[PDB]
Amino acid sequence: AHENVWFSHPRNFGKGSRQCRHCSSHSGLIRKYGLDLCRQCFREKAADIGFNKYR
Amino acid sequence: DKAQHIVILDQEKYDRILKDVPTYKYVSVSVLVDRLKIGGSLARVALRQLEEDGIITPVLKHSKQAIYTRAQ
Amino acid sequence: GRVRTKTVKRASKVLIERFYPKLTLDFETNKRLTSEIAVIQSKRLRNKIAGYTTHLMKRIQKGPVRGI
């Protein structure tokens, strides 16, 4: 049947199992502390989250 | 084999050692290796035996530097 | 090197102009006085002002100096 084949491959334990919260890209994600933001999106949102540059 | 040292001890090694080792200011291991053409572990066992003997007395001990002086 | 910038120098000049009798020739007493006189917002800047003021005072004793 159609619905049995669609999206059947298991998307856990991989790059395709995770995505950015903001833009849903699979590349360069930051998973530390459950951030789940790709590194560019985190560079944009760090001030909002509470991450600041000191040294 | 450029070095070509002694591997086992015979009567003449015994005689040479006991005619020449008292006449050395210093022996460590390589002293005997150099001016006896003897091998390393053989030099070591010979030095220990003669250190129980009254021909060489240790000056200081180390697991990689034997130091012996004249019997006097 | 340690060359004093314009902020500390002008601060010291105005301290000497406006409170000369109070200022002394001692760096510690000058520290406690410059804490009371001016409202520097940093310990380091306060110290630099007070010390350069002490140096200026120790120069002024040997005759007037042009600028104050």
Place this chain on the structure above:
Amino acid sequence: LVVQEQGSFQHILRLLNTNIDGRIKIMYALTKIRGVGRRYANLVCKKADVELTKRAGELTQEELERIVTIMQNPTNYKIPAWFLNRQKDQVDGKDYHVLANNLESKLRDDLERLKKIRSHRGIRHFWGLKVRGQHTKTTSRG
């Protein structure tokens, strides 16, 4: 101590199955055979109850006999099967610590069975390429 040998200068340069020099400890001497390493040589000398401090020439007929027996009959002298090259065989499923030239013969047998079925590992062996999936773009110009 030291042995004061005379009339028995051990310089027997021909030895067990391979022209092993008799001026070195027996442990690393058995390694000279094609099929024995330092680990296996040490274990075989331990089971042969031969002290690991005398050169190979010091050894005599009974010791050589025992060394041969261990080397060709490992599943008789309390040698664990996990210690032997050429474990459970692709013929009878048995353990065979293969020694000299029959070792290369078994190697050719493996090559022949791979090439006969036309397997990728056998094909890369036939060409002469690395079979363990290593990159050969750059680090193969030797």
Place this chain on the structure above:
Amino acid sequence: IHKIRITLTSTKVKQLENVSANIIRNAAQYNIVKKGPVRMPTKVLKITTRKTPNGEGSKTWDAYEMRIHKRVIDLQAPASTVKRITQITIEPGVDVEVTI
């Protein structure tokens, strides 16, 4: 008499110190004993990421830090008082929790 524990964390030092002094004042209008405050070592959440949104240029990195400060105070007091002692201190930026 119970073993009520108050533990509170924040990212801002000054607000946390003000609210801790506030709970001290609130327990000081009564006479609740004050074993703390005790100061846990601060947590520094460090993220090092590449500045460039691509892969070109000199290799430069940003070191973002989030700082977390935790404090504990042990209050021995009847279970009624600590409820108000805590729920009247809702100063923003400080998350406070109560455990026996």
Place this chain on the structure above:
Amino acid sequence: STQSVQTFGKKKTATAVAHVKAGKGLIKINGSPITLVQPEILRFKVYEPLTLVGLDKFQGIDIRVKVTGGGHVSQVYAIRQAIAKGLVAYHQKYVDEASKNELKKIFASYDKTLLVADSRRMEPKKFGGRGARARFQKSYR
């Protein structure tokens, strides 16, 4: 409490806390004599708080140290510095300030580290290079 002082001593990150209370000449390292800790060479650095001044300053005092951190050489240096500080503080609050002045003169005439702790720290590692100052190799074309 009868007669006790508490001093520390530091090096790279190695920290030694001393416990010099009144005793019988007992000088120990974590519960072992000064005559051995781990090494065989650097024992004389911790012998220095003794040989410079003589053993008689320790007649009635017993010293304990809880060195923790750093490495072997760092611990040895921290221990001997802490021993010197503890002896000086004992002479300060119990024995004699003139005595401690003579002792610290001996130390400072031998080694300023005995009283003045070394204030050196590993400079942080910077991106773009393996070390604090070392850099990744540059490849022009």
Place this chain on the structure above:
Amino acid sequence: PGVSVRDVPAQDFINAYAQFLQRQGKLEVPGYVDIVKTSAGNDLPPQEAETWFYKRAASIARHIYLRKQVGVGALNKLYGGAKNRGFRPHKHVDASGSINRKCVQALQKIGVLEISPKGGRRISENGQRDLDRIAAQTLEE
């Protein structure tokens, strides 16, 4: 004034305790001490192969003696070295677990170590005396 394990160099202490415990002959030396290897990150068996287990047992027993409530994992990490990983860089790897377990269990049956509360093995009341008396002989020399 007596003497204990802390007053002696480690080398000779473990030497004497190992040789003595070998002299007794009651320690259950495993039947595999000739085949097996000390560590997965090791390349050769112990050279003094007929009595190495007694050396290891003496060292382990002293290691509990100086501490309290240690386990098999801690000793495995203590006796693990630096693997020679080939072209790749070095790394710490844990030692053999079966060897250490059998060693501590044999030390149990000789009554030298006891099963401590909530994990680990302390030293037995009689083991303290055994080690202390065996240490007192070396220091008399």
Place this chain on the structure above:
Amino acid sequence: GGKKRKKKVYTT
């Protein structure tokens, strides 16, 4: 630009 993605041929 990715060799200008072309037309594609059909076998079915």
Place this chain on the structure above:
Amino acid sequence: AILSKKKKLVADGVFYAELNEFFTRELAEQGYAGVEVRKTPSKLEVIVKASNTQGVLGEQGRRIHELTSLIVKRFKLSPEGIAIYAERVEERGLSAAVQAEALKAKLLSGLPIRRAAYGVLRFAMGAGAKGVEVVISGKLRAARAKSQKYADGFMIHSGQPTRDF
């Protein structure tokens, strides 16, 4: 759900970032200046500062109630678990977000770039700012992009005081 303190604080920051993104994308044409959530025993207090407070609370408060429902059934909190309010900005010319939104709105209407830039600068100075700067970048009047700067007053660039002022 047991989040750690590290994870709790990080998730709180991400929640604030998402909520600000949402209010920017929903209250764009009301001079949205910012939001601040007050964590309390039951009702986290949400305040949204906008230039046009009547843009929200449109027709008896429709807007805020439907935004409240939006947030509660997106983030799955108690319907009585939050509270949303709105306070007018005390000085719009002192708000960078308000000035930027007004500038954007003027550009879409069709007003020329120079006049809108100077309008923003003079509004900021009339508010009481010690300095103000507007930079407009892109294809300005032509197919070749350029950046046009407008400055009035004073402006610091390096050091901590930028983060403060």
Place this chain on the structure above:
Amino acid sequence: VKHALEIIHVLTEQNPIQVVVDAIVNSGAREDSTRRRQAVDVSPLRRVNQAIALLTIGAREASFRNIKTIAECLAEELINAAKGSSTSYAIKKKDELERVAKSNR
């Protein structure tokens, strides 16, 4: 270095501290040249530091592929440089530096 001091004392009759001090003060070349190179006269501290540097080098490259251990090579180098004889790696370099440097004047 402690095995050194020991081995020199077993061989020498003087104090090995004196042996090394004399070797170092006699292993510092006096004429060396800077750019042809205009030969100039070397400073004290520099003569000292090349003395120690050459002694350690000579020992190090004698100990490469040699059964004679590192402290033993050091001892022989120190003995040969202590006597002033051209049998030490430093003393032969002390020959070459002046031998070249004189031509450079």
Place this chain on the structure above:
RNA sequence: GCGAUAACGAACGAGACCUUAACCUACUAAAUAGUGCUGCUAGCAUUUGCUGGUAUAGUCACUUCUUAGAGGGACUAUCGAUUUCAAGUCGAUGGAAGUUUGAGGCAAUAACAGGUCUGUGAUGCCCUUAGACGUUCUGGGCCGCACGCGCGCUACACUGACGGAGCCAGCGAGUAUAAGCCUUGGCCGAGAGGUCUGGGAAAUCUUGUGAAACUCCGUCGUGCUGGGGAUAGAGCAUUGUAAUUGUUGCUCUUCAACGAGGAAUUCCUAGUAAGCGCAAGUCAUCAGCUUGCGUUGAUUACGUCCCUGCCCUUUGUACACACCG
């Protein structure tokens, strides 16, 4: 900055600033830190001592050590000399601190047709949009190997390999109806690893992360040899739906180049280089990679414009796409 002055008064940058490292036995408090005392104990010795153990009730004391907030502390302080006596500079004494105290974050105006449309539900235009250049499924490729180049790791041995013994840091990270996190203890197997329990949402447990270099005592003994660990066969596991093109881990065997590197060229001034590991990111599995951290810890300057460049003035110019003219 002192000063000079057709200027005068300003502004940004620099400096200040902020973060961090170093000092405080001087405030404030630690049952998630420690030191003691006092109980209940053990081995030695019996002098009441030396080593330890346990008691979050002993309804014990305290804050040197550790933690963190409030502050203090250097300002070149004092002194000796040179300088337009001016801004400074060199030495000493004091000191934790005397290069801007060390280390960083931040960082002007003007620009580049520098990179990114492959971070983006950031985008104009062009293209395509149902046999789709949307999306999804199976399988393969990005790893393919006469060959050239860059960043690296391991090495070429005795200042060394091993084998036992000593077992010394610091920065961090961690989950619960998982699809499972750090994992301690107990028990099996040589090991990889397996299993039964326990602790930890964490200064509480993992963890003192007993790291590795390093120290000692032994075997080897100058040689491609016990140096070096490629390539290759057999076997045991682990992750994963799937290990063949070996994922990785472990055992036996095979034992290749390489004996210090040409013309060239990179990095570096003190707790720095070099050595050595460790943690975190990528992560189902996989670190020879980066980002940090500590352990051991140097030789040589502390100058110069020869080379490569940079800044300021004068000067020439037929250059301005600016001498790659």
